Design a protein around this ligand. Structure first.
Ligand SMILES: *C(=N)C1(NC(=O)[C@@H]2C[C@@H](S(=O)(=O)c3ccccc3Cl)CN2C(=O)C2(c3ccc(I)cc3)CC2)CC1
Length: 219
């Protein structure tokens, strides 16, 4: 794998969004992964509808603003035959009746791939596939108030993940001792972290479970 990857540079990543006071992180993780894979396929970056996923993916197992799984989102897109654009089906931050309209479908998927539960496997995926949906343990105040640098939380769990985000690359700081990170896009607005991103500790015993439930859609 390259020593550093940043898919933002290659046009795969939309601007940071804000989930608000709805438990829809999983939807933003899923749209981010599918935005990447559609861009790879078509050369067009089109922002996708989280609201469509929040409102419509109950049959696949998702719980709207009460949580969900990226893999269930990818299954919904496959079962449904499409996913609307953000423009056509804007984000409300509340669960509402399903208003999917196939006329405005701009994405598809044919399934998904679960990555092996090792950081080395995650690195190989990020290097070759594009942005990857991941689960992290985000349940420490250190994460809520994260501002800059490499996030390391001694009490982070590699098993107890509660937040779905998007790995858009990886690299290393030149400053001193433990300087490698995953470049992670959050869905908490641009105000949080580093423009809405968190450079998370990489190759430090699967810190915060970042490699424990990683996946991406096939297109
Ligand atoms: C996002 N605003 C919130 N978190 C969730 O919905 C997270 C997302 C995923 S995950 O990324 O944490 C995860 C965890 C374990 C295995 C795979 C994945 Cl993708 C699930 N979320 C959860 O909080 C839990 C969950 C699991 C399944 C369902 I349906 C609903 C919720 C509790 C694991 C809402 C805060």
């Amino acid at each position: 794998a390259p020593r550093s990857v940043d898919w933002r540079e290659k046009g795969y990543v939309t601007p940071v969004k804000n989930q608000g006071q709805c438990g829809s992180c999983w939807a933003f993780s899923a749209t981010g992964a599918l935005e990447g894979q559609m861009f790879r396929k078509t050369g067009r970056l089109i922002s996708l509808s989280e609201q469509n996923l929040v409102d419509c993916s109950g049959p696949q197992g998702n719980e709207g603003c009460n949580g969900g799984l990226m893999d269930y989102a990818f299954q919904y897109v496959q079962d449904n035959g499409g996913l609307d654009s953000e423009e056509s089906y804007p984000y409300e931050a509340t669960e509402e009746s399903c208003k999917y309209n196939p006329k405005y479908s701009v994405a598809n998927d044919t399934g998904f791939v679960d990555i092996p539960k090792q950081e080395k496997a995650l690195m190989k995926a990020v290097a070759t596939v594009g942005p990857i949906s991941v689960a992290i343990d985000a349940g420490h105040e250190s994460f809520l108030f994260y501002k800059e640098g490499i996030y390391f939380e001694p009490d982070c769990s590699s098993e107890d993940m509660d937040h779905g985000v998007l790995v858009v690359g990886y690299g290393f700081e030149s400053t001193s001792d433990n300087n490698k990170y995953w470049l992670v896009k959050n869905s908490w607005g641009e105000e949080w972290g580093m423009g809405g991103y968190v450079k998370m500790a990489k190759d430090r015993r699967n810190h915060c479970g970042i490699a424990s439930a990683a996946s991406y859609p096939t297109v």
